[PDB]
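Support case: magnesium ion complex. Customer-provided input:
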Amino acid sequence: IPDPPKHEHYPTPSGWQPPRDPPPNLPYFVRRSRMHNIPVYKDITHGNRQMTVIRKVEGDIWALQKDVEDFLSPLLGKTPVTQVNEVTGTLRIKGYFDQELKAWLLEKGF
Amino acid sequence: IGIRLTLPPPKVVDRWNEKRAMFGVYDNIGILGNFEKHPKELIRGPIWLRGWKGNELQRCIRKRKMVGSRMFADDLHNLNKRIRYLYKHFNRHGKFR
Amino acid sequence: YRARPPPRRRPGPRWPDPEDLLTPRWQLGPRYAAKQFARYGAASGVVPGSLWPSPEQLRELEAEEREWYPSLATMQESLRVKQLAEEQKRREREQHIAE
Amino acid sequence: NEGHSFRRQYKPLSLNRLQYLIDLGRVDPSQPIDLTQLVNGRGVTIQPLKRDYGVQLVEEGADTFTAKVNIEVQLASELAIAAIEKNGGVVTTAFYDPRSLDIVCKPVPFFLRGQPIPKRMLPPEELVPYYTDAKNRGY
Amino acid sequence: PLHKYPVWLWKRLQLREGICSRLPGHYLRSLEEERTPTPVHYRPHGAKFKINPKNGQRERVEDVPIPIYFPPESQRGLWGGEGWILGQIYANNDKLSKRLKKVWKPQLFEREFYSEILDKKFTVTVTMRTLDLIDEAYGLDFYILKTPKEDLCSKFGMDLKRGMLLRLARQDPQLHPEDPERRAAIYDKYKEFAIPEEEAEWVGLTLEEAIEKQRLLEEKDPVPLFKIYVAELIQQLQQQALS
RNA sequence: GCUAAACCUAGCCCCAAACCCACUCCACCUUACUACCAAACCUUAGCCAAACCAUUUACAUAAAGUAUAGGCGAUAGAAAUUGGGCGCAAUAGAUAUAGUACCGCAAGGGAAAGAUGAAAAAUACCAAGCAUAAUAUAGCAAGGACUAACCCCUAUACCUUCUGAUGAAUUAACUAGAAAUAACUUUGCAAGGAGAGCCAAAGCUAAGACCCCCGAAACCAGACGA
RNA sequence: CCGAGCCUGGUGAUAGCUGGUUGUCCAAGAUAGAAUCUUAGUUCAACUUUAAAUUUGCCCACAGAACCAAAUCCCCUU
RNA sequence: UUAAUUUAUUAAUGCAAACACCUGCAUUAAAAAUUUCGGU
Ligand SMILES: [Mg+2]
Ligand SMILES: [Mg+2]
Ligand SMILES: [Mg+2]
Ligand SMILES: [Mg+2]
Ligand SMILES: [Mg+2]
Ligand SMILES: [Mg+2]
Ligand SMILES: [Mg+2]
Ligand SMILES: [Mg+2]
Ligand SMILES: [Mg+2]
Ligand SMILES: [Mg+2]
Ligand SMILES: [Mg+2]
Ligand SMILES: [Mg+2]
Ligand SMILES: [Mg+2]
Ligand SMILES: [Mg+2]
Ligand SMILES: [Mg+2]
Ligand SMILES: [Mg+2]
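Agent response - structure generated as follows:
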C-alpha cells in the first residue's frame, strides 16, 4: 500500500489528513499508521471497561502523559487514570475520550 | 539404598558442535525469503503430526485419517482402541460440566 | 561450518509417473495437468488442448444450462401471470368481504 | 432459524469509506470502479461463502464528497444513486452468481486456476425483476 | 512401524508381482475395469442436479448402489442380475418402531434354451426378468454376445459366453457339420461379437482359473543343458569356421 | 560387620526411508517331525448415552462441525468447490533372559533375574534385623530442664466419614489432571486483522490456563472342553 | 466355583457407590427457600468472593404501620 | 403366560406371480422376539 495521492485541500473530503512537515520540536513523538492515520484506538474489556490508548509513542512519554492529563483536566475534572507502556512505547488513558484525543493529536500536527 | 555410590560418568558434552551449530539456521524461511515456502514445511518429522497440533484425541484422529491403511494390524486395533477410549473420554466424566 | 543452502522451489512443474502406484488421484487427473499448465505456462506444459472443454462436456454444459437457466422473457411471463392471479385473488377477496 | 441459511448476505460498502479510499488513494478514479477495484486495494472485503450476495452501497451521510466515479454494485439506495449522480457518477447493478462472484472477487487465483474463463450467469427469478427495472439504475 | 505401500491395493500389488503378472494384457484389462451394471432394485435417479424438496435448493444428488446378495447356487446357472437382499425392515415400514433384519429372495424358474451358436439345448434356472432380458435381446446367443461379463453377474453364463466366443472365433466345421450353409448364415448373424483367436485364451475364466491357465501355459519341460551346450558348441564351431 | 547396597548396557521406543520372510540331505496333514495300493462363502452382535427404559447410537487446509436426520429426546453426519531424538536404563521401557519353566485335560494364561577390571596365562562407609553391648519402678517414650541417662512437672498414638469408629508389621521402589469454547491478562498490528477460509459498529492473530486413579456382577461373537 | 462350563477379543464395559488422590508462602472467606420415579445425587434460590463501573451505608428519633406479649419494619442525628 | 405388543421364523389357508415347485401380500396360530411385577 503506498502513501495517498494529494487531495489539494486539508482536511480531505472525508477529512483525512497528511502529517504536517516539518515535525514539531516536542519530545513527545507520534508515528502514524501503516494505512496512514493518527494512531488512536479504543479498548473494550470486562463488560463495562471502556478505555483508550495511543499506540506508537516515542521519546519521553511521561511528557505526553502529563499533556494528556492536562487536556483531560478540563474534559472531566478528575485526574487522568493513565499508564504508559514504556517497553511497548505506548500510552493508555482509562475511559474513551477518543475523538477529542484524535483532535488533540491533530492540533499538535505531529 | 536410593543414591549413587560414586560420581557418575563425566558428562563430556561439547555444547558448541556442528550438529547443533545451525540449530534454526535458515529457519526464518518464509518472510525472509520472499514468501517461496513457509516454515510450515521445514520440519523433518512424522507425517502423522507435522503441524496440526490438537489434543490427544485429536492427535490420534489425525493419525488414523492420515496413515491407517499403512499400519500392521496391531497398530490398527490399538489406534481404534484408544480412539474409542478418547471419544468416550471427552464428553462423559470430568471436573467441568 | 556453513550449512547446505536453504530450500529452493521445485524445478518447474513436474508431471508424475502414471505407472506409480503411490500417487493420489488429486494431482494426476484431467484438471491436474491443467493446474500444472497454470503453474509453469506452456513453457513446461503440454499442448493447450486441455484448456478448452470437451465436446461431450460441451453438450453436458448445454444440458446443464437447459436444466439450470431460463430466459428472461419466460421469467417475465411467469411474473405477469403471478401478478394477474394476485390481482384477481385480491379482487375476489375484496368482493367476498364487501358482500 | 428456518431460512437463515437461504438468506442472502450482501457486503455493505461504506461509501464514506469509498470517499476515504478515494482520498487515501486505495482506489483511484482514473479507471472504472468495479469489484476488481472494490477488492484490489483492501478497502472492504468480500466473503464468497455463507451463501452470500456481493457488494452493495451504503446509506449514510454524503456531505463533503467531491469526486467522479462509476460505481457497479449489486444494490444501492435511491439516495445512493442520487449521491453518485450529484457529482455525476455512474450506477449499474447486475448480478454476481455464487461461483461467478467467487471467481470475480479474488481475481488473482482464478487467473492462475487453469480452467478457461467462466461467464456470469443471469440472476435468479427473484433477483430477475430487481435487475429488470431501471429505477434501480441497474444493468 | 508402518508398512510402505497401502494394503488397500495389497491384492492389486500382487497383480503386478510375479508369475501371475505374466498373464495376458487383455486378461489384465478384463480383470482391471470395473464398469457397473444396471441395478436389480436401485432404480436410477434423474440427473445431476435437482431442486431440494423441502428446501427448494438446487443440489446435486446421486444414487446408492445396493449390494447384490448373491447366493452360491445361483452362480451354477444362468440367473439374472437379480437375487436376494439381506438387510432389515420396520414392521409398518415406520422408523419409530423396532425394526428387524429381513431378506428379499428371488423367485427363479428352471427353464431351457436351445442355442444355435451352441447348437444345443441347455436347461437351467433363470429369472422371468432374465427371460425378459433374453427376449429383449431376442435369443440366448445374442444375449451372450450382448451383455458384459461384469454385466452378466453369473459364472455359468460367463462360461457359456466364453464357449460361444471360442466357437465364433474358431469357425470350426464341427459347429455345424454337414451343414456349412447354416454355419455361414449363423456366422453372418453372429458377426457382431467377433473376437480375436487370442482373446479366447483368458475368456471369462476365474482369477484362480487365470493362474491355472498360466501354469498350463508358462510351464514346459526344461531345455537340456546337454542340448544347450551342444547348441553353444555348434555356435562356436560356426564362429570358428569364419576364423 | 553381614545381609546388603549402588554401577551400563544389554537391547527395547517411536518415527524416516524401504515392499519383505520362506530348498545342508531328509521327514513332516495317520497318533503332525513315519518311504509305499483302488469338502467355500449364508447382513457381526450387543451394550453404552436417554442421568430408569424401548425407536437412534462408533466399532493435506478450507466450506464445515453449515445444508441431512433426531421417543424432534441424545447427538451423529456430507458432497459441490479449492489446493533423527525436550525416550528409557533390569520394579521403566517390547512380558522379553523365551512365548521357555510352571500352571491347567486343551484354546490359553503367562514369570523371574545381571553388573569385575585394558588384561582372569593379574585371584574405603550407609534401607530394616542382629551382634558388636541385653534390663532398673511409672505409663504415647517426648518436651522444659538439668550435677546427672531416668526418677521432676505438663503431656487422650496418626490419616480420614462423621456432628462428636476402618486402614497401615517395617523398609526400598513404582502409582494417580492432559479436552481452551467463552471471558481475562500479557505481546504484535489497526478500520482491518491475520502466510486462500473466519470475523470485525475496536477489533483480529500468538500463548496461557477447566476437566483423575482404583474397584462390579453384565452381555455378544469366536473358539475349546464328555 | 454350576443356578447356569471355560477362555480370548469386544472391554479403559457399566451404577449418581466407597476410598485415596502427592512441596511452600501471602488476600478473602461456615447453614436461608422451591422443584426432583427425589432426599446417598442434581436443577431453579440465596449468599458470597473476586474484576470493572457508579457515592453513602450500619447504629437510629419523630410520625406511621388493622379489624377479626417480648415486639418488629419504614425510620432525622450520633 | 389368556400382561402388553408384534411376528424376524415356521405351519396353514386365501390372494397374487409361473404352468407339482419358488416368491410376495394378509390372517391365524405354534413357537419365539421386545418391553412391564410403584412408594410411604
Ligand atoms: Mg479493547
Ligand atoms: Mg440411561
Ligand atoms: Mg468430500
Ligand atoms: Mg524388563
Ligand atoms: Mg516387563
Ligand atoms: Mg543400620
Ligand atoms: Mg509422670
Ligand atoms: Mg496426606
Ligand atoms: Mg491389617
Ligand atoms: Mg470386574
Ligand atoms: Mg480389556
Ligand atoms: Mg471406571
Ligand atoms: Mg449410586
Ligand atoms: Mg415431579
Ligand atoms: Mg413422573
Ligand atoms: Mg432417586
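The first helix of chain A runs from residue 61 to 76.

Case will auto-close in a few days if no follow-up is received.
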